[PDB]
C-alpha cells in the first residue's frame, strides 16, 4: 500500500499480459504458424479481382491454382511472414461457407460507388452468422476520381457501410504500395479466436492425391497434404471432411514443407484396439330378434396453392394461438387418443422416461452433459496426445473416401478436415436455439425438410420448433415465428457447443435461401416437446357460475373421457366440467366468475412430441444466388 509497491504491481501485471499476448501472436503466422491465411470476398460485380490479386500479389510468390479457383502462397522475409490468399465469389454459398469456416482473416473488397451487393449481402449475413474470424475492408476505384468525388465517395461509403459494419476504416487498394500497406496491416491484427476451431484440430487441403483399392469399388486412399491449425491432432481419433461425411483414416505422415519461411517419414500408426471405430448408431440391434338393447338390459401452380394454404394456416395459427376445429364423424376421443390435460403447464409432472418411440432405442443419451464436456475439454487443453502438433505439414492417407470427392476438389472446391472429439460421430437428439432473418418472409412449418450447418456439418433434417424456456415442458410451435427465438430439435450427430446454426431452404433448383441462424443449446433427448391442441366451444346457456356449452364435443361419453381435464376461458375464468347432458356434445360446467356472452370456452390437450428420423448426410450442390 504505497506509491512504489503498487506501481510495482502494475509492472507485474503488464509483464503477465504481454507474455500472454506474445505467446499467442508468434504461434500464428511465421516460423511456427502454418501460414497466416486470408480469404478474399468481393461483394459487387464491378470488382475485377484478377486486377486486385495482381496488385496484391507482391517478396516471393508460390503460385498454386485449382481447376477454377486460384489460391496461392506468399512469402516475405522482409516482414518474416507467410500469407496464403484464397479468393472466393459471393453467392457460391457452398465454397464460401466451407472455406471461411477455416479461413483466418477475411478481406472484403468493395466497389467505390456503393457498399454491399445483394449476393454479397446474402453471403455477408451467412458469414456474420457463422462467425467472422477477422474482417478488413477494402476498395479499388478511389484513385480514378480527383479529390472532390474521391472524398465524397469515401463519405458515402462510410455512411453506406456503417449501417452494417459500425466502425472500420476503408483501406483503399490502387497501388502495389497500397498492397504493401494492406499486408503490413493484416500481419498485425487482433485475431478473434473463434471458439469452435481451437477446441479441435483441423487441416486445410493444400493437395489431394487418390489411390483406389479397386477402381470399380470407387473407394480408396485419399491423400490430404496440408498444415494443422487446431490442437494436437491425435491419430486414434476419427476425421471428417465437411462436404462428404465422416470416415476413419489410416496413415499420418510428415513430408517436408514445400514452402518454408526461408529455404514418407511418419509419426504414428493406427492400432485399432485403441482407435475408435465407426458405430454411428447403437451397434447392438335368449334376447328377442326384435327388440333393442334397452329392454334387453331390462332382461406448377399446385405449389402456389400449397403456399397460399400455408399462409392461410399461418393466419389461422397466428391470429389464433393453436385453435383446432373439431372432428365430427370419428369419435373425438379416438382421434385425440394420446392426449391428456395438465392443470398447470409449468408445474404438473410429466415422466420423461414414459413414451419413448422405437427410434429412441437408437440414440446415445448423456447422463451429465456439462461435466463430460469439462472432462473432454480438460483433456484437450492441459494434456499432450501422441499425434502431430500445429504447423506440421502433414499428409493423411484416409482409407475410405469416394472418388467424386477428388473430382470436386479438382473442380476447385476446397476440402477441409477436422478431427472429432470423443463421442462426436454418434447420433443423438440435438437442440438448436435459432431465430429468423428478415431476408426471407416465406412460411416455415414444423417438419419442413431443411439443411443445417450445426458446427462444420452439412445435412438435410426435419426439426420441431419450440418455446425457449428453462423449464421442463416446452411447447411445440407449429410455424417458425418471425421474431421470437425458438428451439429446433433433430436426430443428428452430437456436437459440443458453441456452434453456429444456419438453416436454408430450397427455393427452386439449388437456390438455397437463408431462413434461420443461431447457436447450439444443450444436446440431450431429455428435453421433451409438448404439442398442444385447443378445443373450442360456445356457452349457449349461462347461469350463475354454471354454464351449458356445446360445439366442443359431439358424442356424450367423450365428456366422460375428458372429464378431469380442466377448462379455461379467454376472459380468464378457470372452471372445470360437470356431467354431460345431451346425447350430442353438450355439458354443464362449474366456474368461478360469471361468464360473458361474448366468450369462447376452450380446453387444452397435450402430448409428447419428438422429431422424425431423417439424417441423410448428403447435401445438394448449391447454385449461384440471385435476388428474388
Amino acid at each position: 500500500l504505497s506509491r512504489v509497491d503498487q506501481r510495482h504491481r502494475a509492472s507485474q501485471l503488464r509483464k503477465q499480459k504481454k507474455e500472454a499476448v506474445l505467446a499467442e501472436k508468434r504461434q500464428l503466422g511465421g516460423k511456427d504458424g502454418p501460414p497466416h491465411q486470408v480469404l478474399v470476398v468481393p461483394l459487387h460485380s464491378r470488382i475485377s479481382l484478377p486486377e486486385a490479386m495482381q496488385l496484391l500479389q507482391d517478396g516471393t510468390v508460390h503460385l498454386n491454382e485449382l481447376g477454377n479457383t486460384q489460391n496461392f502462397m506468399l512469402l516475405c522475409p522482409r516482414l518474416k511472414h507467410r500469407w496464403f490468399f484464397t479468393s472466393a465469389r459471393p453467392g457460391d454459398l457452398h465454397v464460401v461457407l466451407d472455406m471461411a469456416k477455416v479461413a483466418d482473416t477475411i478481406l472484403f473488397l468493395l466497389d467505390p460507388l456503393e457498399g454491399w451487393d445483394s449476393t454479397g449481402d446474402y453471403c455477408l449475413s451467412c458469414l456474420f452468422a457463422q462467425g467472422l474470424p477477422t474482417y478488413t475492408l477494402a476498395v479499388q476505384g478511389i484513385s480514378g476520381l480527383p479529390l472532390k468525388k474521391q472524398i465524397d465517395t469515401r463519405k458515402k461509403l462510410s455512411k453506406a457501410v456503417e449501417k452494417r459494419f459500425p466502425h472500420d476504416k476503408l483501406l483503399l487498394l490502387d497501388t502495389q504500395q497500397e498492397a504493401g500497406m494492406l499486408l503490413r496491416q493484416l500481419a498485425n491484427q487482433k485475431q478473434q479466436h473463434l471458439a469452435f476451431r481451437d477446441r479441435r484440430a483441423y487441416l486445410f487441403a493444400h493437395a489431394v492425391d487418390f489411390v483406389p483399392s479397386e477402381e470399380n469399388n470407387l473407394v480408396g486412399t485419399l491423400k490430404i497434404s496440408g498444415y494443422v491449425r487446431g490442437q494436437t491432432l491425435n491419430v486414434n481419433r476419427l476425421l471428417h471432411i465437411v462436404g462428404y461425411g465422416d470416415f476413419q483414416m489410416k496413415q499420418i505422415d510428415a513430408p517436408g514443407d514445400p514452402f518454408p519461411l526461408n529455404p514418407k517419414v511418419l509419426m504414428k500408426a493406427d492400432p485399432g484396439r485403441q482407435e475408435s471405430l465407426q458405430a454411428e448408431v447403437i451397434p447392438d440391434p335368449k334376447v328377442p330378434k326384435g327388440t333393442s338393447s334397452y329392454q334387453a338390459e331390462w332382461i406448377d401452380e399446385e405449389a402456389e396453392a400449397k403456399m397460399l394454404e400455408k399462409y392461410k394456416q399461418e393466419r389461422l395459427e397466428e391470429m389464433f394461438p393453436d385453435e383446432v376445429d373439431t372432428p365430427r364423424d370419428v369419435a373425438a376421443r379416438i382421434r385425440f387418443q394420446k392426449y391428456r390435460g395438465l392443470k398447470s403447464f409449468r408445474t404438473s409432472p410429466w415422466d420423461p422416461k414414459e413414451n419413448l418411440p422405437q427410434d429412441y432405442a437408437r440414440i446415445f443419451q448423456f447422463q451429465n452433459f456439462t461435466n463430460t464436456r469439462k472432462s473432454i475439454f480438460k483433456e484437450v487443453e492441459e494434456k499432450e496426445v501422441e499425434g502431430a502438433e500445429v504447423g506440421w505439414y502433414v499428409t493423411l492417407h484416409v482409407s475410405e473416401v469416394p472418388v467424386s470427392v477428388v473430382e470436386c476438389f479438382r473442380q476447385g472446391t476446397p476440402l477441409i478436415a477436422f478431427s472429432l472429439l470423443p463421442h462426436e460421430q454418434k447420433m443423438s437428439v440435438l437442440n438448436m436455439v435459432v431465430r429468423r432473418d428478415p431476408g426471407n418472409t416465406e412460411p416455415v412449418k414444423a417438419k419442413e425438410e431443411l439443411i443445417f450447418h450445426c458446427g462444420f456439418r452439412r445435412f438435410r433434417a426435419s426439426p420441431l420448433f419450440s418455446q425457449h424456456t428453462a423449464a421442463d415442458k416446452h411447447k411445440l410451435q407449429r410455424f417458425l415465428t418471425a421474431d421470437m427465438a425458438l428451439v429446433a430439435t433433430v436426430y443428428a450427430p452430437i456436437t459440443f457447443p458453441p456452434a453456429s446454426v444456419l438453416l436454408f431452404k430450397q427455393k427452386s433448383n439449388g437456390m438455397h435461401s437463408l431462413i434461420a441462424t443461431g447457436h447450439l443449446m444443450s444436446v440431450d433427448p431429455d428435453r421433451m416437446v409438448i404439442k398442444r391442441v385447443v378445443l373450442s366451444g360456445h356457452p349457449f346457456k349461462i347461469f350463475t357460475k354454471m354454464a351449458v356449452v356445446r360445439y366442443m364435443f359431439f358424442n356424450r361419453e367423450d365428456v366422460l373421457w375428458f372429464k378431469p381435464v380442466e377448462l379455461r376461458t379467454k376472459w380468464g375464468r378457470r372452471g372445470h366440467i360437470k356431467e354431460p347432458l345431451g346425447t350430442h356434445g353438450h355439458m354443464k360446467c362449474s366456474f368461478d366468475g360469471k361468464l360473458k356472452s361474448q366468450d369462447t370456452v376452450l380446453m387444452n390437450l397435450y402430448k409428447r412430441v419428438f422429431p422424425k428420423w431423417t439424417y441423410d448426410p448428403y447435401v445438394p450442390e448449391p447454385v449461384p444466388w440471385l435476388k428474388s
Binding site: 443419451q365 447422463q367 366422460l560
Partner: peptide
C-alpha cells in the same frame, strides 16, 4: 380407461454417465 393408462418406463438411449 378414461384419462390415464399404463405407459411404463421401458427402453432408453445410450447414456454416457459422466
Amino acid at each position: 380407461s378414461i384419462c390415464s393408462t399404463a405407459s411404463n418406463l421401458y427402453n432408453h438411449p445410450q447414456l454416457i454417465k459422466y
